[PDB]
Amino acid sequence: VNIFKAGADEERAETARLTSFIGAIAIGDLVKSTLGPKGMDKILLSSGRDASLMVTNDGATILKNIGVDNPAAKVLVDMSRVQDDEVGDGTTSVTVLAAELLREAESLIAKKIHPQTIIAGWREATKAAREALLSSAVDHGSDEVKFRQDLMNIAGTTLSSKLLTHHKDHFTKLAVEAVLRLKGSGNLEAIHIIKKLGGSLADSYLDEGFLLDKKIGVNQPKRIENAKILIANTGMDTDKIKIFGSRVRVDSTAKVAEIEHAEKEKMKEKVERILKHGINCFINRQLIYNYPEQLFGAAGVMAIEHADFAGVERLALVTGGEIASTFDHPELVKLGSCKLIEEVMIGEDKLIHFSGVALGEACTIVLRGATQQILDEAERSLHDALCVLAQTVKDSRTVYGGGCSEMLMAHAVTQLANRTPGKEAVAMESYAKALRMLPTIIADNAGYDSADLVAQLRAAHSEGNTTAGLDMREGTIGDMAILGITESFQVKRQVLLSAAEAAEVILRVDNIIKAAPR
Amino acid sequence: ELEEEAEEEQRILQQSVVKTYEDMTLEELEDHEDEFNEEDERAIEMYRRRRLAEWKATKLKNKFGEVLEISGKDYVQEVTKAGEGLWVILHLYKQGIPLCALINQHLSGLARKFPDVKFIKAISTTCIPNYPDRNLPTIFVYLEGDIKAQFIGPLVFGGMNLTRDELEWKLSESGAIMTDLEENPKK
Amino acid sequence: KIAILTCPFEPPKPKTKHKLDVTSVEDYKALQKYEKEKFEEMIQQIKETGANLAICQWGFDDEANHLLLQNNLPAVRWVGGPEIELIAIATGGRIVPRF
Numbered sequence: 035v036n037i038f039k040a041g042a043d044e045e046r047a048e049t050a051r052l053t054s055f056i057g058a059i060a061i062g063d064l065v066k067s068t069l070g071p072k073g074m075d076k077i078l079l080s081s082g083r084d085a086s087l088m089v090t091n092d093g094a095t096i097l098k099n100i101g102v103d104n105p106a107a108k109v110l111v112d113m114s115r116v117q118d119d120e121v122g123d124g125t126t127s128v129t130v131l132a133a134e135l136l137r138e139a140e141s142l143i144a145k146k147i148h149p150q151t152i153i154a155g156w157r158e159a160t161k162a163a164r165e166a167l168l169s170s171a172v173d174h175g176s177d178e179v180k181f182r183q184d185l186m187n188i189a190g191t192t193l194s195s196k197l198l199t200h201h202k203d204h205f206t207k208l209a210v211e212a213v214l215r216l217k218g219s220g221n222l223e224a225i226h227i228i229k230k231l232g233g234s235l236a237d238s239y240l241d242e243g244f245l246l247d248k249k250i251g252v253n254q255p256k257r258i259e260n261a262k263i264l265i266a267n268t269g270m271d272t273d274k275i276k277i278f279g280s281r282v283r284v285d286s287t288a289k290v291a292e293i294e295h296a297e298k299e300k301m302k303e304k305v306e307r308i309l310k311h312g313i314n315c316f317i318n319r320q321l322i323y324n325y326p327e328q329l330f331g332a333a334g335v336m337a338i339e340h341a342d343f344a345g346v347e348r349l350a351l352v353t354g355g356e357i358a359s360t361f362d363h364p365e366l367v368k369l370g371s372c373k374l375i376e377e378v379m380i381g382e383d384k385l386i387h388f389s390g391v392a393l394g395e396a397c398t399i400v401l402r403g404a405t406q407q408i409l410d411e412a413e414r415s416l417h418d419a420l421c422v423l424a425q426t427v428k429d430s431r432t433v434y435g436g437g438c439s440e441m442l443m444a445h446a447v448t449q450l451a452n453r454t455p456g457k458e459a460v461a462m463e464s465y466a467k468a469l470r471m472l473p474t475i476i477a478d479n480a481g482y483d484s485a486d487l488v489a490q491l492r493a494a495h496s497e498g499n500t501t502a503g504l505d506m507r508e509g510t511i512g513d514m515a516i517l518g519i520t521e522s523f524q525v526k527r528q529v530l531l532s533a534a535e536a537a538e539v540i541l542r543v544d545n546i547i548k549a550a551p552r
Numbered sequence: 553e554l555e556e557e558a559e560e561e562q563r564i565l566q567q568s569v570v571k572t573y574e575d576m577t578l579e580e581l582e583d584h585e586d587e588f589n590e591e592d593e594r595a596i597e598m599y600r601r602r603r604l605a606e607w608k609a610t611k612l613k614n615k616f617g618e619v620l621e622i623s624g625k626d627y628v629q630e631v632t633k634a635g636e637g638l639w640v641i642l643h644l645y646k647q648g649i650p651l652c653a654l655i656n657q658h659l660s661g662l663a664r665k666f667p668d669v670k671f672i673k674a675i676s677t678t679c680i681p682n683y684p685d686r687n688l689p690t691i692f693v694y695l696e697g698d699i700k701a702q703f704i705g706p707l708v709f710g711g712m713n714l715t716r717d718e719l720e721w722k723l724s725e726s727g728a729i730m731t732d733l734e735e736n737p738k739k
Numbered sequence: 740k741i742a743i744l745t746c747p748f749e750p751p752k753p754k755t756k757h758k759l760d761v762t763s764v765e766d767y768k769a770l771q772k773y774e775k776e777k778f779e780e781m782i783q784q785i786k787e788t789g790a791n792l793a794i795c796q797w798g799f800d801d802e803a804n805h806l807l808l809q810n811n812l813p814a815v816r817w818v819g820g821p822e823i824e825l826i827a828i829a830t831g832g833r834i835v836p837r838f
């Protein structure tokens with residue numbers, strides 16, 4: 035007898051894990067074609083309204099854009115998005131590793147092994163692998179030149195799997211420089227990425243100051259030397275007295291004429307109070323109406339209308355001023371400083387160029403490609419590189435990439451498995467196989483002999499050479515210490531832990547109950 | 553037009569499906585007077601007594617007058633306890649945006665034009681936290697707090713052609729959403 | 740020392756509907772002065788209790804935010820009701836409804 039609903043169903047057997055495994059493997063196979071320096075990106079086309087088209091390489095936006103149906107696919111997409119939020123890298127890596135973990139899981143359950151046995155084996159294996167990765171982590175930060183070289187290597191390895199690889203030598207350092215302007219503040223919003231079409235992608239440059247996409251007023255000057263910027267968050271509009279319930283109730287036209295004259299005079303006195311600070315520039319958050327603009331033009335200052343919260347925050351960071359709202363006491367927290375406020379033209383548009391800024395705490399990156407999709411992909415991948423660089427500035431521990439860290443931690447898992455009895459050992463062996471399946475995939479997407487390369491790496495790591503990985507520009511087994519394929523320790527640790535946790539949570543379901551759709 | 557009232561006594565019929573005393577309310581019910589027969593008089597007085605009684609009953613309902621002075625701290629009381637069945641038209645705005653100024657002035661005119669529904673107006677920023685500036689002109693109507701229509705957009709609203717069409721768009725609810733656009737189409 | 744607070748950092752207004760008639764430029768200037776001194780007195784009254792931090796349930800505006808900044812008195816806004824109650828129970832203060 036059926037009891038649920040019309041449209042509600044239950045899969046309480048091998049069918050449930052069949053659906054979960056096939057969905058996770060579909061996610062893994064879709065994401066798999068975008069790993070390594072030789073990975074190839076994808077086109078996302080919307081069948082709905084506006085037919086949005088986006089060319090992308092990373093797995094986070096690929097998985098979040100598509101509409102997944104299988105709940106396991108939803109689990110993988112959520113894990114990828116969470117991992118992108120946490121660090122900003124390895125979303126494709128974590129999704130692929132989870133997919134291979136589930137594949138080895140179904141292979142094991144074919145051999146009639148209880149899922150909790152696999153769970154215990156995986157817990158022990160991930161503990162050992164995390165311990166080995168932590169033991170193999172190299173650290174810097176005390177050094178200055180060595181840490182800068184490490185940052186350059188991290189940017190290179192993060193940016194080599196994307197389109198900017200075509201000009202990687204130009205871009206990596208640029209990204210590093212941007213992070214070097216943050217001065218340790220974990221504020222990625224201090225970085226502005228302005229994307230304008232036209233010209234090769236090698237024309238992109240990190241500005242030596244700031245760029246604002248706003249407009250000068252009518253009568254204000256359009257160039258200043260030795261700027262004294264005051265940044266404000268005042269009204270400058272009609273500017274109601276804010277006492278709700280106030281109205282003019284008079285008996286003549288002279289009275290209302292006098293009241294409007296008083297309103298204009300109070301606005302004039304507010305502008306005079308602003309000018310008393312000793313300024314030649316003024317940046318406001320919301321609109322500036324016609325009378326304050328006229329007064330500013332007459333006085334001889336420069337005013338900016340409608341610079342949003344992000345704009346004023348970035349100007350405050352790059353110039354050093356405070357966000358003013360009340361100008362009663364000009365002697366309190368002071369202004370900012372620059373050296374030129376020239377208007378500079380890019381493409382066909384004009385932007386305000388703050389040069390000679392007092393502080394480098396914020397900056398702008400100009401992205402200029404030949405196609406809007408190229409601009410979007412460059413922006414997303416540059417965001418990933420900046421995220422990783424900021425994360426490794428916060429925590430300078432690094433581990434070698436190219437599969438070397440994966441190979442060594444898989445070797446540790448294998449060594450632990452060899453000394454553990456029972457059916458746990460095969461679970462840990464499957465864990466190690468799934469973990470080693472990543473460099474296999476990188477070589478496959480590259481197009482080399484994956485089996486030979488992986489066997490060579492296994493032999494080299496078992497011997498003791500703990501810095502061996504895939505040299506992809508030639509396709510052999512090289513030394514990541516000499517070559518310089520580094521990676522953030524935080525990124526790899528988060529990838530491992532998140533993938534293992536998602537595999538564990540998915541594997542222990544034996545019943546899927548779907549309610550009737552709305 | 554009042555010009556048809558003086559051209560000639562011959563205005564027999566043109567597009568008048570019904571013509572009786574039952575739909576003459578007050579303004580015109582007292583301009584015929586001598587043309588209302590005599591046998592059907594008592595029915596006319598019964599009808600006028602009933603309809604003036606209904607108007608007197610609605611006098612206790614249609615006294616709101618103009619706009620009022622609600623802010624964020626008074627939102628919950630006047631959107632969840634404002635009354636039973638009384639329409640409330642919440643407005644979220646900020647000073648500086650011109651289109652929302654247009655719709656504010658038109659709403660203010662509507663306030664005296666229609667006193668049955670007392671809409672309330674509130675500042676966008678200090679009514680809901682972190683409201684983006686991309687939703688500067690906001691209007692949503694409801695009764696008993698169950699939000700019915702919450703159209704959002706700076707330019708999709710079309711405050712230039714709002715006047716009567718979107719006046720009744722806000723006014724007419726509890727039924728088909730598309731009910732008054734065909735009256736005053738933009739074309 | 741935290742100043743757990745409920746009423747917003749905005750000029751007061753009675754719950755009953757009201758109309759403040761302004762009839763001359765002198766009255767308009769008096770209204771401007773009333774607004775300015777209301778903000779200044781509010782901020783100085785927050786400061787005079789010695790609090791290093793304030794918390795308001797109902798949020799506030801820019802002319803208050805700059806005053807809180809320039810007097811070296813950090814504060815947060817738009818804190819929910821239950822959050823206000825939990826803060827009061829934790830930090831040991833008392834919820835006050837008026838400055």
Ligand SMILES: Nc1ncnc2c1ncn2[C@@H]1O[C@H](COP(=O)(O)OP(=O)(O)O)[C@@H](O)[C@H]1O
Pocket residue numbers: 068069070071073091092093123124125126127191192193194195418435436437476504506519521
């Ligand atoms: N130039 C390279 N040489 C060797 N291995 C690389 C190189 N670039 C990336 N890898 C490896 O490929 C894996 C995935 O890289 P990538 O596609 O950049 O991940 P994501 O798409 O999350 O940025 C990483 O674990 C890294 O070790």
Ligand SMILES: [Mg+2]
Pocket residue numbers: 123124191192193195
């Ligand atoms: Mg990467």
